Design a protein around this nucleic acid. Structure first.
Lengths: 73, 95, 103, 97, 78, 98, 83, 93, 105
DNA sequence: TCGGATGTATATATCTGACACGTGCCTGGAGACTAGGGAGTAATCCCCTTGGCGGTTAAAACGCGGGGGACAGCGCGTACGTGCGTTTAAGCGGTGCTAGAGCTGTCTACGACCAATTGAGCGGCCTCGGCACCGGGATTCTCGA
DNA sequence: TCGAGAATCCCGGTGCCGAGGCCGCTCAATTGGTCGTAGACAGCTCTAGCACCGCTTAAACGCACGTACGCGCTGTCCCCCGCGTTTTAACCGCCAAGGGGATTACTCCCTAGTCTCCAGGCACGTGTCAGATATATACATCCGA
């Protein structure tokens, strides 16, 4: 299953994640395909700020989901 | 002296089963006792209310299952009903 | 006994007596206490496992209310179940607003 | 030397929010509880555990209200909390008339 | 008496919440809200111990009063 | 060509709808939405009309209360127009999950 | 018969009127989507509770009284339909 | 089938209070629901208090304490005065 | 005086309340003084609400009572409003309040 | 500040469908009496709460330099209110029809009580190892340059 | 950007008291069994939810146009914050006393339960006026020269 994340720049990038995939792994994926360190990556889905460590199946993020991202310098 | 009753031994057995080498404090025992009592009170009250609500004077497995589906959230509700029905069928298999 | 037949830890007889004497209903069936005990044992086992993992994280061997509070407030569903409740000697989760952080 | 404002404040934030002990002095709280209970009845006697429980509940309620006030204050594009934030939080919570 | 809640104490209590700066009237505002909260809680507890026909306030009465307002507490046998 | 200044007609509508007492959302789209929502949980469910009416009344009350709290938050923020962030803030402070 | 894309039934003027009853004066052009989402989640919760209640009843029709029970459970009881 | 309600009693109370005022059906249903809700609340609170105090019988005292608990100050005072007057009137004869 | 309600000079019934209390599984045994007290409290509350509603209806030059009058009476009294702080009334409406700053200058 | 166009509150006929009232009856409530278990009353004991005194020291209180933050004023370019014309689906009025809610009789398996029995669970003791406290050293930001 | 100084975390050593285990004992959980009734089932009966067809029109959608409001930039003035010194009362540690909570034993009286009889309230039915619709008019209010 794949979702999408858009930043404030309007660019939406596909993320190939899994229910067992964690926020640490997804931010590693953003590091791999965008280069942005996770310490600037801040993300909202359904108005909730996720921590690092949980799983997507815990929050049951459905497929084709679009997340909102900013870079906190 | 008053013979006060608690759930210390049973939760101790459960803790030993799930974790071999782990200790516990007295405040944790009080907290677990209170939590168990609260959950039991909630479930029993809801089940009794529903049983007398659908014109019946008998409380069985069914209204307890319905209450477990009601108060408990989804995934844990499914796990709870699975565990409960497994226990019931295991008990009724023997005699 | 009766808890031995179902392969459970919690006592069936105590639950049965509490249900009967708590005037919840005029009469009670023979299948209720087993189900209730199984559900209670599942919930307490989940809570104890989370608390034990949290305690093992901090290089300790005993469980104190802080570990229970952390385990309860970390799991989403367990947090939403015990929403309007408070735990003595618990504390708060380590959160700081992003804006408040220095430039 | 000197420390710029806002640093030791964060230090205290981390230190206090890491710990799990109470902050209000016991004796003034007991005196206030006894005096406020004098109105409904005189010559009342209190067990210590009751006072401890009251203190714990009051501290938890105050901390929750302060967190909500801070959230409202940052939403209003400010850094310092003000009494209007307190009243707005109490009103939205649905407790104040 | 009521002014016994020191300014540093309430400052620390707020600091646990996670607030950086503090203005002048917050101390009085929290004193008032604490007064209201305590008034309600020990009024309910006093009523309970009145019906109990006893001259001592027990922690169980406080636990029951806290529960009756949807603010139940764990760790004192209730 | 008469041109009222902005906000006057808004005041007129505010007063008119506050004075009245009947519901506002049309019936058939609400019934269709309720049936479609209930389709997922269980198939071939038949609904009584009074149940749909009760659902509409409850939704009306909830939405009115939420909009009132949103307006309170918006006027607190030193603005005149409500924004989604006000809705999220009100939902968060109320104690319901956002 | 399959039903889909019914959430658009709640039109923009209806939401504007609902806000106007509350007392709002000026409306931004983006609140409609989150209003629809909030209505959707509220309806989902209430409908699920009512469906469970009628499922225990061993029937195939949902009455308003079950809706009243479900509304009462969430601490938002309602007067005007009996019970 | 019989459908029990509190219609005639509410009508009698309304006639006693106001002499020339009528009532509609929806308002009567609202009053019936309100009366049922208040009765349920008071009875449940009284039963819980009686079980807390380790007693096996419900009397006037626990009802009075429940009224003091739920209802606000002046309302509780007026209600308890009316209740004690009614009970002493009943027990006089 | 045959009926129990006539004995205490009350309008609400006594036997119905007693039977509902007995069959409501609230307690193992019930006394002989609970129903009269409960009926008196219920009658007082109903009389208060009804007189408020009647005054509100008279204020609008009408004769019959409609749920809007009940909503106005309930929400215009502080203690009664606090008693029903989490209750929604059908067709009641809202209170006509406008924020001061929204008004034109 | 004014005046015309607009919207709103007021007066009046009228016709209708919801509301107050008369009637029969039947099912729940009241009169009468029992019988026993639950509650009220009276001693008695001893455990926990109140009270008070000495110290010590950590916390509280008061004053001062100052840089960062709340608040007001100005400019602008856009996002939404308003009016108009066009399209379209909601609402109303009958018409069919069948799935299913609701009530009735049966007979049957399931749950309460009671008498004999025992071992699982609770109270008291102990002992020792996990945790608290203190001295010492390594690391890392954090403000100045 | 590069410099140092407290602040903080990690490590080792030492001491202490709460938890885990053990032993003795009394009461609540088993067990074999009878008897009454709660309800699962079969049936049947009438009601209301669903599908639909046609007509009407008030409501919905899209567009032009204009303005006032959210937002960024600038400045000022002032007020909490971080240190440093002086003042005090909290807490510990201990010692004394008693009165109120917890328990036991005795007695009496209040209510569940049963029977018989009867009238209070409910379903059914009907006349009728309070209020919504429609109409017409005078008063209040809003934009602009």
């Amino acid at each position: 299953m794949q979702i999408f994340v858009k930043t404030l720049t309007g660019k939406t990038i596909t993320l190939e994640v899994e229910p067992s995939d964690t926020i640490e792994n997804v931010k590693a994926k953003i590091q791999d395909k965008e280069g942005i360190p996770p310490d600037q990556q801040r993300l909202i889905f359904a108005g909730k700020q996720l921590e690092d460590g949980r799983t997507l199946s815990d929050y049951n993020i459905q497929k084709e989901s679009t997340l909102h991202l900013v870079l906190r310098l | 002296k008053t013979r006060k009753e608690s759930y210390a031994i049973y939760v101790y057995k459960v803790l030993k089963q799930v974790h071999p080498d782990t200790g516990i404090s007295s405040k944790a025992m009080s907290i677990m006792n209170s939590f168990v009592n609260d959950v039991f009170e909630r479930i029993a009250g809801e089940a009794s209310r529903l049983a007398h609500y659908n014109k019946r004077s008998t409380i069985t497995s069914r209204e307890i299952q319905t209450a477990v589906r009601l108060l408990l959230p989804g995934e844990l509700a499914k796990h709870a009903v699975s565990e409960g029905t497994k226990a019931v069928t295991k008990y009724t298999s023997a005699k | 006994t009766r808890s031995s037949r179902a392969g459970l830890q919690f006592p069936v007889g105590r639950v049965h007596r509490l249900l009967r004497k708590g005037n919840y209903a005029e009469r009670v069936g023979a299948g209720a206490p087993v189900y209730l005990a199984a559900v209670l044992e599942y919930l307490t086992a989940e809570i104890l496992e989370l608390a034990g993992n949290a305690a093992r994280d901090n290089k300790k061997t005993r469980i104190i209310p802080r570990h229970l509070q952390l385990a309860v407030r970390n799991d989403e569903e367990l947090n939403k179940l015990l929403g309007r409740v408070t735990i003595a000697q618990g504390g708060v989760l380590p959160n700081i607003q992003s804006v408040l952080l220095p430039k | 030397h000197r420390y710029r404002p806002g640093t030791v404040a964060l230090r205290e934030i981390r230190r206090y929010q890491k710990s799990t002990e109470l902050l209000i002095r016991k004796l003034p709280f007991q005196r206030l509880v006894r005096e406020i209970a004098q109105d409904f009845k005189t010559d009342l006697r209190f067990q210590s555990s009751a006072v401890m429980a009251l203190q714990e509940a009051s501290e938890a309620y105050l901390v929750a209200l302060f967190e909500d006030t801070n959230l409202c204050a940052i939403h209003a594009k400010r850094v310092t909390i003000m009494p209007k934030d307190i009243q707005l939080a109490r009103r939205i919570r649905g407790e104040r008339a | 008496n009521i002014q016994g809640i020191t300014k540093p104490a309430i400052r620390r209590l707020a600091r646990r919440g996670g607030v950086k700066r503090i203005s002048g009237l917050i101390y009085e505002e929290t004193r008032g809200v604490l007064k209201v909260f305590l008034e309600n809680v020990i009024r309910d507890a006093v009523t309970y111990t009145e019906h109990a026909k006893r001259k001592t306030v027990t922690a169980m009465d406080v636990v029951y009063a806290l529960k009756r307002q949807g603010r139940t507490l764990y760790g004192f046998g209730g």
